[PDB]
Amino acid sequence: LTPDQQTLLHFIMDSYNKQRMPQEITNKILKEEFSAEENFLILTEMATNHVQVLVEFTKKLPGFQTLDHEDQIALLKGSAVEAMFLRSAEIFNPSGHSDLLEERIRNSGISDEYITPMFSFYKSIGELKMTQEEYALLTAIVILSPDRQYIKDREAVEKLQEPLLDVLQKLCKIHQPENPQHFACLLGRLTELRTFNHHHAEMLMSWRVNDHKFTPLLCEIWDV
C-alpha cells in the first residue's frame, strides 16, 4: 500500500467518480414510450453517453497526455467496446429501473445471440461483487492495453498499464485474502470481455441493414 501507489489510486478514483449518467437518460428509460424504435433510440443515447465519459476518463489517465497522438486514438477506438460493456456492467449492477432497462435492451431489434451473452456476462461480473476501486482500475487497464491494433509504441503503453495492475493485484490481496486467486479471476473477466469485440461488430452489421441512424460520436469511435 505504497505512498506513490496510494497517490495513483486517488488520481484514478478522482477521475472515475466525475463520470455520471444524465438524469434525462434515466428519465427516458422510465417514462418514454416502449417500442423497438424508441428502445433503440434510448440505447443510442446511452452508448453516446458512455463514450463521452470514456473519453473524459481516458484523457485524465496518468501518462496518457504524453503518449503519441495517433496512439491515443488507437487506444480509445481499440478499447471503446470493452470499456462500454464494463461500464454497462457496473451501472446495471439505479434501483429497478434496471428491470425496465433490461426489457428495453431485450426489445430493441437485437437477436438473442447477442442479448444472451451480454446478460450472462453481467452475471459473471456480479458474482465477484467488485469494489468501485476495482471497476475503475479494470477500466483503466482495458483502455491502456498495449495489444490493440495500430499502436506504434507498445512499450510506452505497457509502462502505464503495469503500475495499475500492481495496485489492482494488491487490492485483491487486501479485500479478498480468503481467496488468493481473486486477481486471476478478474483477469479472467477481461478474457470474457474481449469476446464482445466480435459480438458488437456483428450487431452493428444487423443494425445497419435496418438502416439505423447513429450519432457522429458513435460513427467515429467505431469506424462506421
Binding site: 463521452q52 497522438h69 491515443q72 477506438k77 457522429p216 460520436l217 467515429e220
Partner: peptide, 11 residues
C-alpha cells in the same frame, strides 16, 4: 485523423 475524437481529447 479522427477529428471529433481529437477535439474531445484536447478540451
Amino acid at each position: 485523423e479522427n477529428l471529433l475524437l481529437r477535439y474531445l481529447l484536447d478540451k
